[PDB]
RNA sequence: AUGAUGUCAUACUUAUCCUGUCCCUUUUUUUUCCA
């Protein structure tokens, strides 16, 4: 509806109508705007095809059911790392189990 | 034709994403894919010549993928023909989807 | 069976073709009616001068079009049609307004054509897609 | 003076041309012998009635086409407003409904055609730019879940008129020109120099006596713009009285008082009217333009002003070239108009610059991020650099994300797609900044309002032709003083702006030339030499130049025109010379078209000729669709040479019915294709003049290659085991990578261009036989050299 | 061929014969 | 069917029959003729490319060479009267029409090579 | 087109080889081809028609 | 008994090399019986 009315108003859909809804929907909204919309508009029957790839390659695809270019990216596990650290004890409780202090490195923000 | 070819060749590359220890024969396939990615019209000329004139093909290999509760046959075709088949595949699915061959109940579909 | 089916397809085709043909001939004859009554409703105070202006403009139009066709075989096609398409031309002629488009901060924040699912390989570290810090 | 003997020879040419055409007419009426029972007539009378019927049907719906057009054409400008009566109103509903009725009565037939071929037909064994709306319902299909005021116009026009920098200067300068025949009118942009001056002169009565007022411009479309606005003021139809004539586009009628044209158009009016008798005023705009035609017309009209005192010569320009202007024109007075809208703050870099591209980048970075509202214009040299620039800017865009706001990077040059040229003309979207990376084409004739900043790299791509060896090199060159001056002046047109130069005040005031080399010096002059030999100047040495060319360049020019035969062994015109001279293209192409008559490859050489006319911009080569473009180009590649490749592409385009989306699909610029088409038909409009008969090579590309041989025999190179080397000069050339034979590498090659880019180059080349060179030019090409 | 009278893959083709001077590697093999 | 399955020649001829019928009904559509396609008297020549200096008098003279003329009508711009640079000429014989045509085609009068055609005029 | 149909069906008839056993496919379908999706779904379409009936 | 002629690959020499084809700024030019 915002698209149609932005034709009626003939204004330009700006980033503000589309950052509340940036990772929502099933394709995904951030698919409308990826780089290769132009050569992926010609890939049809890709779902059947990834299904039949099991008779061609000797390995098992655990995401046989989806495609990241076409379906968006349907999960985000970036809070998991943060809350895992807060549950193990924090970087301090985590590094008192390690050889961290025997390195005498002044602090752990530089580790690499 | 070049969009359908780019899609075919990207799909064929997707096997050796790892860039593993592969072998001679996958080495040879990667060679064919790269030289067709560089010079896309000798490729397509070959492809249509094949589709027009060829009717006796080389021999296929079979082996089984052991899934511990049943086995899956895995077929091993040669590179030149894998490229011709990948392009034929893309072309058929594209056209079939444009002329509406498959009614809406044939359902590993691209929509969900 | 293929020969029999080919024949039956062809003849069913031309059957319905002709039926729709007669349907269009009916449509156009009622358009005949429409046109006659159009001119009939036509036939029966700026009207006088704008009318002399009708004959004015149309008559020197036929004069200019005649003599265009005459001097050059078709300079009516050298003059009238080619006049009305080129870009800076139209910008000069003040012609107004000769699809959805939007912000471009959106685009190309993402690049690629392949699914990041490695094509079935799993042993590479693709869990999170933004560095920790 | 020389003007009058020129005149003499010209009128002699006109009567000789008339008599020549008359002789041709009688000759051909001689050559075509007009040699022009009961049941015989009773048999053929039915058949002539058959063709009568049929051609009458074509002609009948043709007159229905005539009045079909005419109904809606006349009702456009009469009905929608005026208080008109029963009769013509009735006729409006009649023509409206009745044309709709005809439209639907043919739409019925069309509908049945398409729905009756729609069906299933068992197979038979027998031995517009919206792919981001074909990918926007794929998502919305995947994501669905259902189960008077015209007086006010004129008062406003005159009110703004009153605020021109020439409007108070009206009467003083009108009396000024009433005094002296020759008047220098020095004035900057926006002054009204081009618009109001001819209006005034219309107001003065210089139009009576049946006189006209000429205003010439260096550019067609600029002439159109000026004409449009002056007609807007004039409140009349542009084209009847205030009119313009440029190539392929006449918008003048016999009411024409104010005729706008280009300098070449006025030159070619000197092909029709030597003393300019119907024009009382010739107003030549921005003559600083340094055009071949500008410095030809200068001399010719100087002689006219000497020989025609009541004639009016007004030549206005922007810059300080008035010294030499008056000096050549015997010290005309200089009327100063002050015009400069808004103040311009020009900044200098603190030191000189090392990598001015990155300096450009980071300059616009900071200007955008820190400046308040206002557009940005930035100069670069050209296309390769310009897309690299936009690459860098859009890279920064991606990396810094929403910590910035919308940076519409807009590149612009001449050969990029025209829709994307139009792209920059949209009014800026609120909140967003509009940054235009440009070539010096946006120095002149592109007025994009809103520009408040402009940055100058102090450089430019200047051509430099040293005839020394025939080298035409588009080289990097620090920009002129006047160049940077107006590159500053390009800004400020709506508000106080800034112009940051990438170089210091030191380098500016110290290391700067005033005006770019008057082109007569730098350019290759074949067409204008042939042209003044067309008017009959035998002694071209003591000719009235403003800037004479070096004797060397005209030497090699004359030797060239002699070699191709246009001059006899003393250097005057052959019949070939003059007939090739009328063709407004260089003699290379004209002599090849001369050969097409001998070899019977008329249409093909016509089309190749039309192709090299605009060639440099045929094929688009985007970075985001590189491979699709390379392939749609490799599609046409035929053996023999890229000239016949161009032949084939035009063949295929006209095959399509001259379709735009054809060229869109096949990665070809529609602009070049369309202009090449109209220039081909213009050559056919001159085709009977030069005595050319229309025959095709019948698929014999040997004839077409041999006609190209006869035309461009000078333009040939041969193999050497140290590279490709010239035939005559034996200086080293190289193969253009964009050439259809770039890796086939023929032993004997013909070319068309001669540049020395990063390597010495030649463009649009073809494989030749060296035997055809002796077949064509045994007096210039002898066997010992091949 | 029958259908036309009435109207790569190099395994199938015969073998290019031996040259006069066999290329060195042809000999060492 | 069989109004198509006979040839390609008379198929396109029947295509001409139709396009004829439709262009007729199409002119009657836009409301010009009272009667539907009266086949025209073959006894008039529509002779175009005419000169604004040649009037009914000189037409009558030059077209009197081949037959008895019935009249000479150059259709007039009504309130200006100047020749439209075409004309109709009316004979007594079909034989006159053909005898004038087959010699007067593409011929020069008053320095203009005029055209002769039969009258398709339904007026 | 009969050309592509002949290619597709002449391609399923190949020699299948494991370590030292070889035979010829003559009856079924090799699913390790790349157009086998199209063949399977079209044939299944014919069987959807047999199961539902043309009317339904 | 050793000729030149060679489109012969191999062998060999100089503490002989690791030293490589990429892509054009701006822009103007008179026209002729229609049928």
Curated annotation (Swiss-Prot), chain A:
Residue numbers bearing the N6-acetyllysine modification: 73
Tissue expression profile of the protein: Widely expressed.
Superkingdom as given in the UniProt entry: Eukaryota
Cell compartments where the protein resides: Nucleus; Nucleus speckle
Residue positions, PTM N6,N6-dimethyllysine: 35
Assembly, per entry: Part of the U5 snRNP complex. Component of the U4/U6-U5 tri-snRNP complex composed of the U4, U6 and U5 snRNAs and at least PRPF3, PRPF4, PRPF6, PRPF8, PRPF31, SNRNP200, TXNL4A, SNRNP40, DDX23, CD2BP2, PPIH, SNU13, EFTUD2, SART1 and USP39. Component of the U5.U4atac/U6atac snRNP complexes in U12-dependent spliceosomes. Within the minor spliceosome, which acts on U12-type introns, interacts with PPIL2 and RBM48. Core component of U2-type precatalytic, catalytic and postcatalytic spliceosomal complexes. Found in a mRNA splicing-dependent exon junction complex (EJC) with SRRM1.
Domain remark text: The MPN (JAB/Mov34) domain mediates interaction with TSSC4 and SNRNP200. Has structural similarity with deubiquitinating enzymes, but lacks the residues that would bind the catalytic metal ion. Contains a region with structural similarity to reverse transcriptase, presenting the classical thumb, fingers and palm architecture, but lacks enzyme activity, since the essential metal-binding residues are not conserved.
Name this polypeptide is given: Pre-mRNA-processing-splicing factor 8
Organism (species): Homo sapiens (Human)
Lineage: Eukaryota, Metazoa, Chordata, Craniata, Vertebrata
Swiss-Prot record, chain C:
Region (Disordered): 18-85
Lineage: superkingdom: Eukaryota
Localization per Swiss-Prot or TrEMBL: Nucleus
Cross-link (Glycyl lysine isopeptide (Lys-Gly) (interchain with G-Cter in SUMO2)): 111
Family affiliation: Belongs to the SNW family.
Complex formation: Identified in the spliceosome C complex. Associates with U4/U6-U5 tri-small nuclear ribonucleoproteins (U4/U6-U5 tri-snRNPs). Component of the minor spliceosome, which splices U12-type introns. Interacts with SKI, SMAD2,SMAD3, RBPJ, RB1, PABPN1, MAGEA1, SIRT1, FOXN3, U2AF2, DAXX and ATP1B4. Interacts with PPIL1. Interacts with VDR and RXRA; preferentially associates with VDR:RXRA heterodimers. Interacts with NCOR2. Interacts with MAML1. Interacts with NOTCH1 NICD; the interaction involves multimerized NOTCH1 NICD. (Microbial infection) Interacts with human papillomavirus type-16 (HPV16) E7 protein.
Role summary: Involved in pre-mRNA splicing as component of the spliceosome. As a component of the minor spliceosome, involved in the splicing of U12-type introns in pre-mRNAs. Required for the specific splicing of CDKN1A pre-mRNA; the function probably involves the recruitment of U2AF2 to the mRNA. May recruit PPIL1 to the spliceosome. May be involved in cyclin-D1/CCND1 mRNA stability through the SNARP complex which associates with both the 3'end of the CCND1 gene and its mRNA. Involved in transcriptional regulation.
Official protein name in the record: SNW domain-containing protein 1
The species this protein was found in: Homo sapiens (Human)
Residues of the whole record sequence present: 294 to 438 of 536
Swiss-Prot record, chain E:
Protein's name in the database: Cell division cycle 5-like protein
Family: Belongs to the CEF1 family.
Subunit structure: Homodimer. Interacts with DAPK3. Component of the precatalytic, catalytic and postcatalytic spliceosome complexes. Part of a spliceosomal 'core' complex consisting of CDC5L, PLRG1, SPF27, CCAP1, CCAP3 and CCAP6. Interacts with PLRG1, Lodestar/TTF2, and NIPP1/PPP1R8. Component of the minor spliceosome, which splices U12-type introns. Within this complex, interacts with SCNM1. Component of the PRP19-CDC5L splicing complex composed of a core complex comprising a homotetramer of PRPF19, CDC5L, PLRG1 and BCAS2, and at least three less stably associated proteins CTNNBL1, CWC15 and HSPA8.
Annotated crosslink Glycyl lysine isopeptide (Lys-Gly) (interchain with G-Cter in SUMO2) location: 13
Described purpose of this protein according to its UniProt entry: DNA-binding protein involved in cell cycle control. May act as a transcription activator. Plays a role in pre-mRNA splicing as core component of precatalytic, catalytic and postcatalytic spliceosomal complexes. Component of the PRP19-CDC5L complex that forms an integral part of the spliceosome and is required for activating pre-mRNA splicing. The PRP19-CDC5L complex may also play a role in the response to DNA damage (DDR). As a component of the minor spliceosome, involved in the splicing of U12-type introns in pre-mRNAs.
Transmembrane regions: none
Compartment annotation: Nucleus; Nucleus speckle; Cytoplasm
Organism, scientific name: Homo sapiens (Human)
Swiss-Prot record, chain F:
Every RRM domain range: 43-121
UniProt cross-link Glycyl lysine isopeptide (Lys-Gly) (interchain with G-Cter in SUMO2), position: 4, 15, 21
Tissue spec. comment: Abundantly expressed in kidney but has a ubiquitously low expression pattern in other adult tissues.
Localization per record: Nucleus
Reported function: PPIases accelerate the folding of proteins. It catalyzes the cis-trans isomerization of proline imidic peptide bonds in oligopeptides.
Family label: Belongs to the cyclophilin-type PPIase family. PPIL4 subfamily.
Stated name of the protein: Peptidyl-prolyl cis-trans isomerase-like 4
Range covered out of full length: 198 to 320 of 492
């Amino acid at each position: 509806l915002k698209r149609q009315e932005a034709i009626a108003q003939n204004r330009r859909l700006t980033l503000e109508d589309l950052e509340d809804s940036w990772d929502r929907g099933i394709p995904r909204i951030n698919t409308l705007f990826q780089k290769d919309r132009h050569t992926l508009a010609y890939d049809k029957g890709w779902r059947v095809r990834t299904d039949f790839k099991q008779y061609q390659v000797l390995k098992q695809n655990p995401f046989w059911w989806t495609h990241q270019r076409h379906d968006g990216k349907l999960w985000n596990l970036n809070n998991y790392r943060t809350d895992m650290i807060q549950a193990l004890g924090g970087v301090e409780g985590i590094l008192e189990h390690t050889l961290f202090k025997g390195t005498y490195f002044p602090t752990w923000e530089g580790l690499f | 034709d070049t969009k359908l070819l780019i899609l075919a060749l990207e799909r064929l590359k997707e096997a050796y994403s790892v860039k593993s220890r592969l072998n001679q024969s996958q080495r040879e396939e990667l060679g064919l894919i790269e030289q067709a990615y560089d010079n896309p019209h000798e490729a397509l000329s070959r492809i249509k010549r094949h589709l027009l004139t060829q009717r006796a093909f080389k021999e296929v290999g079979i082996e089984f993928m052991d899934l511990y509760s049943h086995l899956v046959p895995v077929y091993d075709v040669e590179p030149l023909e894998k490229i011709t088949d990948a392009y034929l595949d893309q072309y058929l699915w594209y056209e079939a989807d444009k002329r509406r061959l498959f009614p809406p109940w044939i359902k590993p579909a691209d929509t969900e | 069976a293929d020969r029999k089916a080919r024949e039956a397809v062809e003849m069913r085709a031309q059957v319905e073709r002709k039926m729709a043909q007669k349907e269009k001939e009916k449509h156009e004859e009622k358009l005949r009616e429409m046109a006659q009554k159009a001119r009939e409703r036509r036939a029966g105070d700026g009207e006088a001068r704008e009318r002399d202006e009708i004959r004015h403009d149309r008559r020197k139009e036929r004069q200019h079009d005649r003599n265009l066709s005459r001097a050059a075989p078709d300079k009516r096609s050298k003059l009238q049609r080619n006049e009305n398409r080129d870009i800076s031309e139209v910008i000069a002629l003040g012609v107004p307004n000769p699809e959805v488009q939007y912000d471009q901060r959106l685009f190309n924040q993402s690049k690629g054509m392949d699914s990041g699912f490695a094509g079935g390989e799993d042993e590479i570290y693709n869990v999170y897609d933004q560095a920790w810090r | 003076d020389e003007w009058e003997r020129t005149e003499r020879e010209r009128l002699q040419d006109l009567e000789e041309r008339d008599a020549f055409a008359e002789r041709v007419r009688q000759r051909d009426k001689d050559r075509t012998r007009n040699v022009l029972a009961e049941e015989d007539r009773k048999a053929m009378v039915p058949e002539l009635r058959k063709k009568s019927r049929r051609e009458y049907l074509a002609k009948r719906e043709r007159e229905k086409l005539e009045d079909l057009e005419a109904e809606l054409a006349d009702e456009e400008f009469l009905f929608g407003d005026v208080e008109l009566s029963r009769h013509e109103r009735q006729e409006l509903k009649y023509k409206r409904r009745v044309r709709d009725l005809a439209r639907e009565y043919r739409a019925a037939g069309e509908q049945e055609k398409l729905e009756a071929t729609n069906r299933y037909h068992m197979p038979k064994e027998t031995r517009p730019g919206e792919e981001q709306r074909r990918w926007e319902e794929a998502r919305l299909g995947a994501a669905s879940l259902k189960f008077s005021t015209q007086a006010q116009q004129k008062e406003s026009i005159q009110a703004v008129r009153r605020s021109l920098p020439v409007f108070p200067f009206r009467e003083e300068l009108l009396a000024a020109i009433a005094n002296h025949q020759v008047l220098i009118i020095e004035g900057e942009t926006g002054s009204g120099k081009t618009t109001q001056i001819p209006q005034y002169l219309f107001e003065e009565g210089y139009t009576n006596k049946g006189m006209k007022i000429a205003c010439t411009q260096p550019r067609r479309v600029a002439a159109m713009s000026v004409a449009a606005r002056v007609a807007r003021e004039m409140g009349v139809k542009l084209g009847n009285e205030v009119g313009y004539s440029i190539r392929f586009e006449d918008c003048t009628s016999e009411r024409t008082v104010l005729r706008y044209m280009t300098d070449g158009m006025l030159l070619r009016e000197f092909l029709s009217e030597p003393d300019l008798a119907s024009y009382s005023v010739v107003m030549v705009d921005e003559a600083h333009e340094r055009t071949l035609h500008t410095d030809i017309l200068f001399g010719l009209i100087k002689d006219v002003a000497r020989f025609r005192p009541e004639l009016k010569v007004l030549v206005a320009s922007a810059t300080m070239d008035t010294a030499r202007f008056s000096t050549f024109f015997d010290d005309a007075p200089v009327f100063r108009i002050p015009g400069r809208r808004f103040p311009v703050d020009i900044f200098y870099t603190k030191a000189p610059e090392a990598d001015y591209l990155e300096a450009c980048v980071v300059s616009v970075l900071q200007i955008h991020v820190t400046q308040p509202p206002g557009d940005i214009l930035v100069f670069l040299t050209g296309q390769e650099e310009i897309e690299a620039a936009c690459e860098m800017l859009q890279d920064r865009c991606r990396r810094l994300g929403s910590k910035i706001r919308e940076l519409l990077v807009l590149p612009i040059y001449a050969n990029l797609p025209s829709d994307m040229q139009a792209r920059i003309f949209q009014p800026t979207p609120p909140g967003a900044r509009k940054v235009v990376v440009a070539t010096n084409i946006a120095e002149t004739s592109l007025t994009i309002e809103g520009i408040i900043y402009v940055l100058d790299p102090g450089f430019c791509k200047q051509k430099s032709y040293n005839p020394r060896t025939g080298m035409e090199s588009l080289t990097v060159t620090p920009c002129s003083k006047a160049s940077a001056n107006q590159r500053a002046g390009r800004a400020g047109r709506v508000a106080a702006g800034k112009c940051f130069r990438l170089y210091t005040a030191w380098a500016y005031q110290h290391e700067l030339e005033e005006t770019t080399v008057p082109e007569i010096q730098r350019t290759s002059l074949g067409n204008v030499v042939l042209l003044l030999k067309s008017l009959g100047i035998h002694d071209l040495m003591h000719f009235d130049f403003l800037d004479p060319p070096p004797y060397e360049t005209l030497l090699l020019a004359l030797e060239q025109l002699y070699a191709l035969g246009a001059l006899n062994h003393l250097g005057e015109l052959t019949t070939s010379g003059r007939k090739m001279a009328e063709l407004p293209v260089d003699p290379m192409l004209s002599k090849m078209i001369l050969a097409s008559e001998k070899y019977s490859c008329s249409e093909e050489i016509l089309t190749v000729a039309a192709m090299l006319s605009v060639n440099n911009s045929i094929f688009y080569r985007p970075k985001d669709k590189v491979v699709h473009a390379d392939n749609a180009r490799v599609n046409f590649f035929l053996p023999g040479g890229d000239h016949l490749v161009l032949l084939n592409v035009y063949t295929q385009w006209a095959e399509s019915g001259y379709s735009s989306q054809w060229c869109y699909e096949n990665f070809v610029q529609f602009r070049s294709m369309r202009r090449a088409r109209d220039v081909r038909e213009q050559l056919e409009g001159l085709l009977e003049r030069v005595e050319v008969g229309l025959s095709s090579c019948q698929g014999d590309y040997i004839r077409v290659r041999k006609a190209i041989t006869a035309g461009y025999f000078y333009h040939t190179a041969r193999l050497t085991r140290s590279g490709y080397r010239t035939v005559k000069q034996q200086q080293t050339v190289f193969i253009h990578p964009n050439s259809s034979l770039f890796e086939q590498q023929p032993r004997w090659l013909l070319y068309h261009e001669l540049v020395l880019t990063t390597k010495e180059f030649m463009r649009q080349v073809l494989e030749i036989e060296s035997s055809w060179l002796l077949e064509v030019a045994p007096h210039y090409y002898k066997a010992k050299e091949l | 061929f029958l259908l036309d009278k009435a109207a790569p893959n190099p395994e199938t083709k015969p073998a290019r014969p031996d040259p006069i001077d066999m290329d060195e590697d042809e000999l060492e093999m | 069917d069989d109004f198509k399955g006979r040839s390609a020649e008379e198929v396109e001829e029947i295509k001409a029959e139709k396009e004829a019928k439709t262009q007729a009904i199409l002119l009657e559509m836009v409301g010009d003729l009272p009667d539907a396609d009266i086949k025209p008297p073959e006894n008039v020549l529509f002779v175009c490319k005419l000169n604004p200096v040649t009037t009914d008098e000189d037409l009558e003279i030059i077209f009197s060479r081949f037959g008895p003329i019935r009249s000479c009508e150059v259709i007039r711009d009504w309130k200006t009267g100047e020749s439209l640079c075409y004309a109709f000429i009316e004979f007594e014989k079909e034989e006159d029409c053909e005898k004038a045509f087959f010699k007067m085609d593409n011929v020069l009068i008053d320095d203009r090579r005029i055209h002769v055609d039969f009258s398709q005029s339904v007026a | 087109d009969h050309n592509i149909a002949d290619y597709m069906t002449a391609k399923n008839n190949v020699v299948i080889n494991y370590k030292d056993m070889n035979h010829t496919n003559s009856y079924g379908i090799i699913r390790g081809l790349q157009f086998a999706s199209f063949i399977v779904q079209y044939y299944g379409l014919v069987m959807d028609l047999l199961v539902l009936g043309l009317h339904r």
